Every structure is written in structure tokens, then in C-alpha cells.
Amino acid sequence: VGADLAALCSEAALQAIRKKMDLIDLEDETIDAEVMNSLAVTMDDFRWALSQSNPSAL
Amino acid sequence: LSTAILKQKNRPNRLIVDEAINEDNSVVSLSQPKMDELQLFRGDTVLLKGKKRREAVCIVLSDDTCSDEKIRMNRVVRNNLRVRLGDVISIQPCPDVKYGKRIHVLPIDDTVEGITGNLFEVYLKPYFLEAYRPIRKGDIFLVRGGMRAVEFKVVETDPSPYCIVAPDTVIHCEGEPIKREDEEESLNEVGYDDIGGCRKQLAQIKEMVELPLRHPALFKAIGVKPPRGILLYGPPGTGKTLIARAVANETGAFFFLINGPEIMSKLAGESESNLRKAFEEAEKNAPAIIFIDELDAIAPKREKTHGEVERRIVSQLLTLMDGLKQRAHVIVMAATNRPNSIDPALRRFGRFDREVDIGIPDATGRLEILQIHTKNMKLADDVDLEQVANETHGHVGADLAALCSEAALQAIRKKMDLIDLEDETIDAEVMNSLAVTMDDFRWALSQSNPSALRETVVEVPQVTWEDIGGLEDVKRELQELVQYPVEHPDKFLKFGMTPSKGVLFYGPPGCGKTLLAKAIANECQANFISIKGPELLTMWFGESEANVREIFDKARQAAPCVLFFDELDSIAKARGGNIGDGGGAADRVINQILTEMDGMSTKKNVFIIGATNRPDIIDPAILRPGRLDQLIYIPLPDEKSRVAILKANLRKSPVAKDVDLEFLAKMTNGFSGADLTEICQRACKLAIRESIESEIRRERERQTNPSAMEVEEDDPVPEIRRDHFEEAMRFARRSVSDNDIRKYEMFAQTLQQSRGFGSFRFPSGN
Amino acid sequence: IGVKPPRGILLYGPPGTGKTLIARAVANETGAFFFLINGPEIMSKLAGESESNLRKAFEEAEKNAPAIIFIDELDAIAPKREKTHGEVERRIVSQLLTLMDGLKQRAHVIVMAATN
Amino acid sequence: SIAKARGGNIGDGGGAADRVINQILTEMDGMSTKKNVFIIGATNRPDIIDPAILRPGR
Amino acid sequence: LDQLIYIPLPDEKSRVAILKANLRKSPVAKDVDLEFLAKMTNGFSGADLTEICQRACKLAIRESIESEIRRERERQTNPSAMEVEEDDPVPEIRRDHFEEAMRFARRSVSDNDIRK
Ligand SMILES: Nc1ncnc2c1ncn2[C@@H]1O[C@H](COP(=O)(O)OP(=O)(O)OP(O)(O)=S)[C@@H](O)[C@H]1O
Ligand SMILES: Nc1ncnc2c1ncn2[C@@H]1O[C@H](COP(=O)(O)OP(=O)(O)OP(O)(O)=S)[C@@H](O)[C@H]1O
Ligand SMILES: Nc1ncnc2c1ncn2[C@@H]1O[C@H](COP(=O)(O)OP(=O)(O)OP(O)(O)=S)[C@@H](O)[C@H]1O
Ligand SMILES: [Mg+2]
Ligand SMILES: [Mg+2]
């Protein structure tokens, strides 16, 4: 259902964050704008998040 | 890479601790490139940041002999940063010291005994002045100016975080001393050091909580809403409240706690005041976390409750959950142990959509929990904690804490013939002579009662391919069915086939079907869920069918995993055998399995395996495509496989090196794996009989003859010899007859291809 | 040694085996400040009055740290919540849970109870 | 006793499994062997016993 | 339910169209003569033809992965050039896979059933 698709998009973008987390610092106060605008969600992110999600309408 | 939030981000300003060679109470010693890269100035103080948000400020020295990653500190700084040796400390330059006018230091009530006087005026009043000593709210400092540790606790300071003692810093000592037990309660707060065996779940909770709180700008700029409700579920005693207190001490965000029976214990119309007070107080201070412990006490299923005030409480909770906004930056998380007992209106989107499963810990988690709990026990060198963690099978962490308690109580009781109950005090030799041995754990483990044995385990098996003898063809074939859709999805995308979901093994009893399933689960590093015959029969007699749906949901939760249905023929054999009753070949439980199997998404990596000792009476509706498809026959083992089986079943026992196992494997033809295991077990039993019967003669002779008793020989029977195998080989038997093997061969030939089509060739036409 | 002693001890058995006898025996034995709670004596009072008695009992025992609290006939004051139909009884059960969890290692208080 | 009560040797249309012996097998496979509980069963007529009890581990 | 409709086993033209329809997902080679296959099979149903096509695709995937393992082992064993960057060894499944997979086909429907 549409809420599951919203959660799918959320988990794809979270995986896209986590692929950069080796560069991303949690402990510093701010984030560089190159790290900010370098985010681009790929097909691998959706293929991850679709394998992870659980549809509640089967 | 789902664990990258646990990494501590190694940076050049990160410093491991070191021992202070300078005994000043607030001194550190750093190198000149360290005091030039961060430009640390002597005369001001650094900003040290330690565990559990506890920080400290200290004067700095230009001692270049310290290494580039270390910093020297005494026990006072090890209290004020709350760190032991080997701990990392963040350092920051702080020239921002603002001074105070009136401070008010306070003693500790049990340290002030002996000589009271006013030892402040004697030692510690001219001790802080003109040394530029930085003070801080929460400074418990060792007193080396006095003759002993008559310590003070710096409590009241006109700057609340910290300051350097100025000439304007006027100190007053009129107040009461600080209690000891409250500070001992303060020294034992909980961080991530106390939690073991839950790295994955802690990573997920850190990703869901710590990241939206520290950086809302990341989610505002990417335009993605963080979640609002996180639900923790699991068996009782797995440490949910522990994780709550851990994140509560971790974040520094404004934490609030709600206890369920504390809400339900009050009068009507009073508990809703507490709920509204809690949410208004947390919305007053935006970086907040609300924790609700034991949620199922305050919101059950509304069909079960009979009061109306309880339904009013549930509706109040729903309204206050939906009234929460993205503006408030408030994360509401709750913990229960019964995920099904909750009113399903709370499960919906925007209320509680994040479910984290705190499961039963495996052996490595058991070892980590034992190492956490046994850090303050005087332990003997005999104690092997890994052996204990291997033997403790059904224990959650609270059971392991009770196990350590009972072991130490047995260690007390072994000295109780010396220990007096009636005297007022205990001697310090009796106190420090306590050392918990392996016998204490072997006692307490025999005494304890694990409250988790009625649970399905979800663990990676340790049975490798080396335990199984031979069978290289089905090894390659199971690799082809299981390992490549996991590893190489893109090849299945380049062509146009979908991988199969099912495998049916069939053959004689005791040939290694369960070992093959566990071995392929070990090879692909997936989880394993086993379901035996008696569980299916239990569902068939009791006519309970939601359990199958709960099983498939549990397997969906732990993906990737294999799912092993042992003995599918059990219900058919129970209802009529082959000849049957008046019914057909379908029933209730296998029907529910087919319904759940046709409805699972194939993009999940759940793979289903079913074993059968008698394949003719299986319902033929399972063998259709889209279901269990590949039929695999597993015969009796040949010579090389019997060699490997006899080798694998003897790695626990010490055998003698003149035993010729190849001769045994050449002599046996119709034996299965269970028969070889029976032979090995009878040999070990005869060896134990020989050992005990030999030691009885030793006891009788050494008590009958006290003449010398000097030689102290070794065992008469170590390393079991060929004589025991020659005796035990008499009682072996073939458990599988020839007509049974004939029947399996006939069913194997019924699955032959069409008798023809060999040497099929296209016409080679240019 | 750094080992926490237990907090709750439950005595169970058939009726007439002398549970109250063992309670009075340890009560005369220890010399610690003993207190007694009778189950139907708690349930016999009015609504909103029994919780006063429970809080009074726990505050009085936490006033004097070497204490033992004994609760006789526990099943009268906390049955299965699926069986009870009053709400005041569930309030009593939740009050007992809160006062049990509010107990600390500081208090040196051992709470033991007997049912059949 | 249950097998003799349900059909003797010739039986009814059913097989050789039932409810109570099933629950015994379920509880027996789940006990820890480090406990010293030892199980003994007597039989005056051993042919009609369920053969699932005679497997190893039982 | 009134109209009884009998649906027999497919003839040659229908087997041609079934083999064409079950292969639009996979890339096949153009020297495969599907009409010869449909002429050779008589008692096959649609499930049998789908089984043949699936076994052919499975053999093709085995050949591709077993060829790429040699590429990995040789390029890690020999770091000499690693320059050519060739295409797939097995794209577009050939007649050899059908000749191998046609051995394991069978008629799933006997003659007495069709007689019935
Ligand atoms: N993973 C763990 N690591 C260390 N200690 C643990 C762990 N799990 C449990 N414990 C110990 O067992 C205790 C159980 O804590 P609780 O949070 O009360 O248990 P629980 O999981 O919350 O179950 P309930 O339903 O609340 S009683 C903890 O206080 C620890 O002493
Ligand atoms: N190939 C094998 N390699 C090693 N041990 C084996 C093998 N086959 C059987 N065994 C042993 O014999 C017993 C049979 O275990 P299982 O794998 O359960 O046998 P099975 O073929 O699955 O059928 P069951 O379970 O006995 S009814 C175990 O004690 C195994 O250790
Ligand atoms: N072990 C015993 N030794 C001596 N007298 C005993 C013993 N057990 C029971 N009695 C006697 O039987 C009485 C029963 O005492 P109770 O404690 O009231 O019984 P109970 O075990 O508490 O069962 P209920 O459920 O409270 S009626 C005691 O007062 C004694 O007179
Ligand atoms: Mg808890
Ligand atoms: Mg009594």
C-alpha cells in the first residue's frame, strides 16, 4: 500500500546515507556541504530496501 | 555496513589515557605538536570529554615524552572523566573560563571521620589558590595535602559547569557532608559497556534515535521524516530497561520515564493528568525521549478489558500520540514483551511502526554477558567461562546473573565451617580468601532453572561440510540452489528465470538429511529454523493453525534463513499409514503450509526444505511447481563416506593410533550413520566400565595396604584401544532391510525421465 | 564480593504445611524489624484505603533498614487479571508492582510471600 | 495402555500415534541432559508400542 | 454451470506458440529450430515444455558462472596484463543446452488418463 511505498523510499534514502558513513562523522557538530549534496540514491539502494521491507497486504 | 554508527571516528584530537607522572589533581601532559595542532596554552585548561557525558577541565604541561595519542591523568581525572585505563578521550581547547565569586565545597560523610577540626582551613583552602586549579561541579578529589583521604566533593560553584580557582573564588565550608551511598549510586550508571551480545540491535537503535536528535538539518535538507514510534519486544529478562537507561545516559537529551503500573496504580482521573503532564513537559524541551515501560499494562486489547476508564486511558494515549508533530523533535519509544497483546490501533502508521526484536542471545552473547557480570568477582584460574557459555543453553541474561549469584553463594557456603554467623564481625582473611572455583559453577549450573526452553532458536549452525562423509554431487547441487541467488542476483536478472523455493529430501532413516540442511545453512551463513514431527502433530490434534502463520512470520523476520520441516509424512502416517482411513490425501496443517508458501514474496531469501523417510504417501499437491520441486535421493553411504563418518564421530574421544578405521569401513556394507554412531558409543561405554572397574581395585588395595602408597600412577585405560572395538563390533546390526532399499529404488525410478531423447541433436543446416 | 542478594522469596505448597509457622519462626529468630501483611485484611477495607495500608507498610519498613516484610495469602490480593472484573483490584495489583520495583538495594529489605 | 484401549493390535482405522505419547516425546526431546532426570518405561506387550519412542535420544 | 468444454493436449502449432511464448524473457540464439522440437514431442503438455526451457536456462547459468570463476582465478593468478576486458563467454543460450536438457524431459500424462 502507499504507506509501505513511503517507508520503502525512506529506507532507500537511509541506505544511501549509510554508504557514505565511512566519510560521515557523527561526532562533529556540522556536516560539510559536499557530503550534503553528494547524496544520490542509486538502484542498489532500492534493491536493498525492497529486500528488507515487509509488505502488510499479502 | 549497517554498523558504521558504532565507529568512534579516529581523529588526531582523540587521546587514549596514560598514567600521570605529575601528582597534581588536575594536570595532564602532552607533546609540543599536540599543543601546537590544537594550540593548547599553559595557564588555561583543556576540555576533556569522557564517558557517560562526564567531562573535566585540567591544566596542561608541555611534556613531549608522551606519545602522540596518549594523555596522562591520575585517579581524580579518572573519576571526573569516568574512565579506566585504555579509554579514549576527546580534547578541546577552552580559553573560555569565566570565574566565580562564591563557591561552596562539601566533604563526604564517611571520609570526615577520624580528625574533623576544620581540615579545609588546614589544608585545602590555600591549596586551590594561585595554582590555577580548575574546579567542576562533581569533583571528588583525593587529598594528598593532608595526611590521608579526608576528601571533599565540590558541589556548589558560581559557574555551574566549571571554572579555574581565581583570587575572586571565595570558598565556604559551612554545609553538611555528602552522603557516601548516593555517590556510590552515582558511580554505577549504565552506558554501552554494560550491554553485550546485541550489537546489531544497538546499531539499529542508534541509527533510528541518535542521528535524528543530533542533526535535524540532515533530514530537513533531504526532506525525509524520521520515525516517531519504536517498539521493543522480546522474552522477559533480556534487558529492555537496560537499553533504555543506556541510551538515557548516552544522549544527553532530556529523558523522561513512564512506568506502566505506576500510571495504573493511581486513582481515576489522576493518571491522565500524569500522561498530559509527561507529554507537555517533554514538549517544553524539544530534544526529548519518552520511554514507556510495560506498555501492555496500560493498553491491552479492548475486547478483553471491561472497565471504561481503561478505554479512556487508551484513547488518551492515542490522542497524545497523534498530537505529536515533527516540530517537537520528540521520539516516543516503548517496550513490551507481548507484541500481540497490544491494541492494534497502536500498531498503525504514525504511532508505532518500528519494531526491534531483542532476541535470545547465543553462545557468544552468553560469553559477553558472563564477562560483564563477573568483572567484580575474585575468580580462580580454574574457571573456563567459554565452557560455561557452551553449557548454558537456555539462559537469558537475567538467568546468567542468577547463575553467578548462586555460584558465589556456594563459594560462601564452602567456608561456612569456618564462618561464624553469631559473631559481630568477619575477619579480613575470611573476606579475601574467597575465590570462586569451577566446582562452584558446576554446582550452580546443575541447580539453576532456565526459563527459556520453550522457545524456537534462530542461530547459525556450526555443522560444516567436513562432518558429512562424501556426497559431493548433492553438495554442488545444493550450492546451485541456495548460494547463487543470494550471491549473484544479477545473473538471474540477465536471463529470465526465477529461482526455486523448495527442496524435498527422501531416503532411508539416519543417512544425514538434517546434517545437510545445517551444513548448507552454515555455508551460506544464514539462520536456521527447525520444526520437528511432534510439533506438527501437536498442531494437528489441537487444531491450532495460527501457529503456522506465526512460524512463517518469524522466518520472514530473520531473513535470510532456511526453514527445515522435518518428517512431513508424520500426519499421514498418524492418520492412516498407506492404506488410510476413508479420507483422501489432504489435511489441515499441510493445507495451511501450502497457503503460506504460495503467498510469500520470492524477493525475500527464505528457502524451504522438507525431509521425508517415506515419500509415497506425501500429498501430491506439494510437488507442483511454485512449491517444493527438486526431489533429491540420499542413499546409504559408501566406503569413503563411512571412513569420514567414523572419523567425525570420534573427535571428542581420545582413541589409540593402532585402530584401523578403513578396515571397519571396508567390513560394513549396509550400515547407516546411526549404526556407526551406535558402534562408537558402545565402545566408549566399555572403556568407561574398564576404567571405573580398574579404579575400584586401586581404592580397595590402597585402603587394604597402607604400606607405601607412593607410586601415583596414571590411568589404566586412557585412549580406547582396539580390544573395545573388537568387543563392541559383535552387537552391531543393519537397521535397514533390503526390501526397504528396493522400495526407495523403485520410487527413484518412478521419477525417471522419458525413456528416450538421449543423443538429441538439432539439424546442422547451413 | 559485588553480588546482589535476592529480593523476593515465594513459598508454595499444599494447605496446612506450616508456611505461617516458618514466617513466625524467622520473625522471632532474626531480631530484624518484622512486619506482617494479611491478604484478606487488606482486601476487607474500603476502596482507596487498602493502598494507604500498603504504602504505610513499605514506608515503615524502609524507615528501619534491617526489615522483613511477609505477605500471607498472596493469591487473594493479586490473581490473574483475566479473571478479575473489578478495576480497584487491578489498581491494587499495579500498586503492589510499583512498590516492589521501587525497592532498592539500599533499603536492605527482603520481601517474602506465601501462597498455596 | 492407550494403544490397547484404542484398538488392541488390530486397531481402528488410525495409525500408531496419539496425543499423550506425542506430548511425552515433545517434553522428552526438550529436557537438558545436564539434569539427572532418568526415564523408565515398562510394557507388558511391546509390539504395539509407537516406534517413534525407540529412536535414539529417547 | 452449463457449458462443458474439453481442452485437449496441444498439437504441433500450439506447441510452437507455447515454446515461443515461454522464451520472450530469455535471449536465445537464432540457430535454435523450435519447429523441430515441436515436431518431435507428441504427448507433452505445457508444463513439460516449460520444464524443458527452465532446465536449459539453468544449464546456461551454470556455464556462465563456471566460466567466470576461471576468469577470476586466472586474473588473480596472472596480474601480467589484465587488459582485454572481454564480453560474456555465454550470452544467448545455444542449441547445445537444449540438446543436453532434452534428455531429462518426460510425458507427465499417461495414455489411460487421456483414454478416460
Ligand atoms: N544483554 C544483557 N547484558 C547484560 N545484562 C543483561 C542483559 N540482559 C539482561 N541483563 C541483566 O538482567 C536484568 C534484566 O533487566 P530487565 O530490563 O529488567 O529485563 P527485561 O528484558 O526488561 O524483562 P522484563 O519484562 O522488563 S522483567 C538486567 O538488569 C541485567 O542485570
Ligand atoms: N553423512 C553423515 N555424516 C556424519 N554423520 C552422519 C551422517 N549420516 C548420519 N550421521 C549420523 O547419524 C545420525 C543421523 O542424523 P540425521 O542427520 O538426523 O539423520 P537423517 O538422515 O537426517 O535422518 P534421521 O534424522 O536420523 S530420522 C546422527 O547422529 C549423525 O551424526
Ligand atoms: N512442619 C510442621 N511442624 C509442626 N507443626 C506443623 C507443621 N506443619 C503444620 N503444622 C501445624 O499445622 C498448623 C498449620 O499452620 P499454617 O501455616 O496455618 O498452615 P499453612 O501451611 O499456612 O496452610 P494455610 O494455606 O496457610 S491454611 C500449624 O499451626 C501447626 O500447628
Ligand atoms: Mg524491563
Ligand atoms: Mg498460613
Residue numbers in the entry:
A (entry chain D): 407 to 464
B (entry chain C): 12 to 777
C (entry chain B): 233 to 348
D (entry chain B): 581 to 638
E (entry chain D): 639 to 754
Original authors' sentences:
We imposed D6 symmetry on both DH conformers I and II and determined their structures to resolutions of 3.15 and 3.32 Å, respectively, according to the Fourier shell correlation (FSC) = 0.143 ‘gold standard’ criterion. The p97 DH consists of two identical single hexamers engaged in a tail-to-tail manner, with the two D2 rings directly contacting each other. The N domains of DH I are in the down conformation while those in DH II are in the up conformation, despite the fact that the D1 domains of both DH I and II are in the ATP-bound state. The main interactions between each D2 pair involve the α9 helix and the α8–α9 linker. The three conserved phenylalanine residues (F768/F771/F773; termed the 3F motif) in the CTE insert into the hydrophobic cleft formed by α6 and α8 from the adjacent subunit, with a buried surface of about 1200 Å2. Instead, the arginine finger residue R635 from the adjacent protomer contacts the nucleotide and the active-site residue E578, producing an active ATPase configuration. The pore loops in both D1 and D2 rings in the DH conformers are ordered and have stronger densities.
The conserved ATPase p97 (Cdc48 in yeast) and adaptors mediate diverse cellular processes through unfolding polyubiquitinated proteins and extracting them from macromolecular assemblies and membranes for disaggregation and degradation. p97/Cdc48 forms a ring-shaped homo-hexamer, with each protomer containing an N-terminal (N) domain, two tandem ATPase (D1 and D2) domains, and a C-terminal extension (CTE). The D1 and D2 domains form two stacked hexameric rings with a central pore. Both D1 and D2 domains can hydrolyze ATP, but only the ATPase activity of D2 domains is critical for substrate unfolding.
